[PDB]
Amino acid sequence: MDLGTTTIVAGQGDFSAYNYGNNGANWPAPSPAQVGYISKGQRDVAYVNGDWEKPLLALWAQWANWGTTLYGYPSLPFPNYEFIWDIFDLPQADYNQFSLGDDRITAMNRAQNHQYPFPNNEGIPSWDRPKIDTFNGGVYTPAAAFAHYLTGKGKKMNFPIERLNIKPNVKAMPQFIGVLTSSPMGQTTVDFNVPYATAKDSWVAGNTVGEITLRIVGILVKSTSGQWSFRGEIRAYDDLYDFNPSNHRTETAEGMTRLGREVGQKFKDTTPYPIGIPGAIPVNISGRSHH
C-alpha cells in the first residue's frame, strides 16, 4: 500500500515503453513514433515520484506554443499525442496500484503495455473505462484526478478516507473543545462538521481534494470526576473535483492555472465530477478536564 510519501530511484531503463523505443532492432528507419516511445521514459521517471505537472505542462506548452520553459524536456514532433496518451495511461497506472497492489514502476509498465496508434477523432483512445472507479492515494493519484477531469465525463470517483493519509487531531478542533466544555454531565451524542485542509497532512490529498468537510460523530461521556471519553468516527462528505487553483502546488501553480483555462479547447468533454470519500476513521480518545 503505497501512499507516495517515499521517493524511489528510477531511470529511463526501468520503463518498457522506453526500452521498446531504445531497441534499435525495432526501428529500421528514423521515426517520430520511435521518439514518442523514448520520451515516455523520462516523463515516467518524473511520474513515479509524483512530479507530474512538469512533464504535462512541457507537452501542453509545445502543443499550445506558449514559448515557455519545457522544464528540461526534449521538444517532440507530436507533443499532442504524448499528452493525450499520458492522460490515458496515468489513470490506469493509479488504478493498477490500488487494484493489484502494483509497485510504482510495475504499475506504469503494466499501464503502458499496449499499442500506441496516433490519437484519433473516432475511438482512439477508447476512454470508456468504467472499472477505474477508485483512487490509490499515491504518486499517480493527482494526475489521475486530472485525467478523469478531462475525459471521465463526470463519472464519480472514490478516494477511500484512509488513503487520504490524513491524521485529524480531534482534541485540537475548536468545535470539539466547545462540545467538551459545554456538553452536559453523563452520556452525549456528538455530531458536527469541520473543514479540513488535507494538504497539511498529505500532499497527494492536498493536490487532489484539498480542503474537505469532515463529519465527527460518536458518543461522549463526561464523569463528575472530570474524566471524559469520546468514542466515534471521522467520516467525510463528497468533494467536487473542479481543478481548483487553490489546490495547485506552488512551483507550477501558474502553469497549471493557465492549462486549466485552455485544456477545454482540445478536451471537449472536460467537466467537474464528484469524488466520494467512503469509510470512517475510528476515534477512541479520552482524558480529563482541568475543571
Q: The domain that contains 69 carries what CATH number?
A: 1.20.1440.280
Shared domain for 94 and 27, answered yes or no, is yes
Of 59, 92, 100, 97, the closest CA to residue 78 belongs to 59
Shared domain for 152 and 22, answered yes or no, is yes
225: left (phi over 0), alpha (psi -120 to 50) or beta: alpha
Amino acid at residue number 71: Y
Q: Is 209 within any annotated ligand binding site?
A: yes
Q: Resolution in Å, one decimal, please.
A: 2.4
Shared domain for 50 and 144, answered yes or no, is yes
Q: Is 2 within any annotated ligand binding site?
A: no
Helix, strand counts (H, E) of the chain: 9, 7
Q: Is 86 within any annotated ligand binding site?
A: no
Amino acid at residue number 219: I
CA of residue 167 relative to chain centroid, distance? 18
Domain count, the chain: 2
**Sign of torsion, CA 86 88 93 98?**
positive
Distance CA 243, CA 241 (A): 6
Residue with cell 502494483: 102
DSSP state of 6: S
CA distances from 248 to 63, 211, 243, 245, 289 (A): 21, 12, 8, 5, 41
CA distances from 87 to 30, 98, 253 (A): 26, 18, 19
The CB-side HSE value for 244 (13 A sphere, CA atoms) comes to: 14
CA distances from 214 to 4, 170, 193 (A): 23, 11, 6
Distance CA 228, CA 251 (A): 45
Q: What are phi and psi of 260, to 5 degrees?
A: -55, -35
C-alpha cell recorded at residue 6: 517515499
Identify the domain boundary among 156, 182, 206.
Answer: 156
Amino acid at residue number 111: A
> Is residue 177 within 8 Å of 166, Cβ to Cβ?
no
Rg (CA), the chain: 23
280: left (phi over 0), alpha (psi -120 to 50) or beta: beta
Shared domain for 235 and 269, answered yes or no, is yes
